[PDB]
Design a protein around this ligand. Structure first.
Ligand SMILES: [Ca+2]
Ligand SMILES: [Zn+2]
Length: 387
């Protein structure tokens, strides 16, 4: 497979994922195994890392990704912003790859939620947003080029353990919510952290658009009343909604595979099936948090009404394996098993790997998994793609 393009690679993390300047240099992409970006760069593959909202909707993360790539101030869209009640504009970036404005292409490699974000970015680049176009013209406000349509700079999207159909882990959270609302707890924690010096050097929640921080002149009384009125607490404009079974399908109904882009999917499992129940159980070696908290639910929760059947029980500790090969629920995308030749406009299913959600990015150890070879082989396939 000879090298047919020299397009750069960008890495795109999933839910909770953090940038290279965060977490004391402990890399999301590589974890305890090393630095994946550096492995790629060392082997002749130009690679950069994106850092978007760890807890934000794919829509918000897509706009952030766009800005970080070509440069400029993040623009969530006037219509979207009005609808969800958060700021329209966000952070300002100088641009990682302005060449993309001048005919350059890029490969995106994404993990978990990042796969949803990457699909959405491609859809927005290709087709823009009709709602944002109409709103801008109707109200006479500016429009981000992201919503124009007619941009084609993404050559490939690779997803690793992505919940294209959602994960039933959100269903567990729906149950737990009755006694412990996890979304609200995390947001309250982020609101506190926003007021504490230095914390964002360790972990940057990137929730500026909700204004969780006390503003310069603001009394605690004003602040508290202002926070009480924020729509953020019960918003569906979050990663949680997009990761859920209903939310992922909603995403799938408009975010489709572009005919100009190669899509690769990698699936993951770290479980074994019980002979009597057909339930799936975490293998020894699965990271402890997933093994105790998530895997038991993922491997036993059924909802025949929703079409959550026995096929949903195999998992990698965070996401149901069947969700990973490509979007299916509410989707018209085609998914084909890899046959030695990568095809445009369809999901190339590259197979299922016996590795858990965190092991596949090296955050959890697994000496049996040759993670270097995994990513270098992937880079070689992407470089083989004919533009
Ligand atoms: Ca492990
Ligand atoms: Zn938003």
């Amino acid at each position: 497979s000879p090298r047919a393009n020299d397009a750069p690679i960008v890495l795109l993390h999933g839910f909770t994922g953090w940038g290279r300047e965060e977490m004391l240099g402990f890399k999301y992409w590589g974890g305890v195994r090393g630095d994946i970006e550096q492995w790629l760069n060392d082997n002749g593959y130009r690679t950069y890392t994106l850092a978007v909202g760890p807890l934000s909707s794919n829509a918000d993360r897509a706009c952030e990704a766009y800005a970080q790539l070509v440069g400029g101030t993040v623009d969530y869209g006037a219509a979207h912003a009005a609808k969800h009640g958060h700021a329209r504009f966000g952070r300002t970036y100088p641009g990682l790859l302005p060449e993309l404005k001048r005919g350059g292409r890029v490969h995106i490699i994404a993990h978990s939620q990042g796969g949803q974000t990457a699909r959405m970015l491609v859809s927005l680049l290709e087709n823009g947003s009709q709602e944002e176009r109409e709103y801008a013209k109707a109200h006479n406000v500016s429009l981000s080029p992201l919503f124009e349509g007619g941009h084609h700079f993404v050559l490939s999207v690779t997803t690793i353990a992505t919940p294209h159909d959602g994960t039933t882990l959100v269903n567990m959270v729906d149950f737990t919510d009755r006694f412990f609302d996890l979304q609200k707890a995390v947001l309250k924690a982020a609101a506190v952290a926003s007021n504490v010096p230095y914390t964002s050097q360790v972990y940057d929640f990137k929730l500026d658009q909700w204004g969780l921080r006390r503003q310069p002149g603001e009394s605690f009384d004003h602040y508290f009343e202002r926070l009480k009125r924020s729509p953020v607490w019960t918003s569906t404009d979050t990663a949680r909604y997009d990761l859920s079974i209903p939310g992922a399908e909603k995403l799938n109904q408009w975010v489709q595979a572009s005919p100009n882009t190669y899509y690769l999917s990698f699936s993951t499992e770290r479980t074994h099936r019980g002979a009597l129940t057909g339930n799936y159980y975490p293998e020894l070696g699965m990271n402890a948090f997933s093994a105790v908290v998530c895997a038991p639910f993922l491997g036993s929760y059924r909802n025949e009404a929703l079409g959550i059947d026995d096929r949903w029980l195999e998992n990698d500790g965070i996401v149901n394996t069947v969700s990973m090969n490509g979007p299916k629920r509410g989707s018209s995308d085609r998914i084909v098993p890899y046959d030695g030749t990568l095809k445009k406009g369809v999901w190339n299913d590259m197979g299922t790997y016996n590795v858990d959600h965190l092991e596949v990015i090296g955050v959890d150890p697994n000496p049996s998994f040759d993670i270097r070879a995994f990513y270098l082989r992937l880079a070689e396939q992407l470089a083989s793609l004919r533009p």
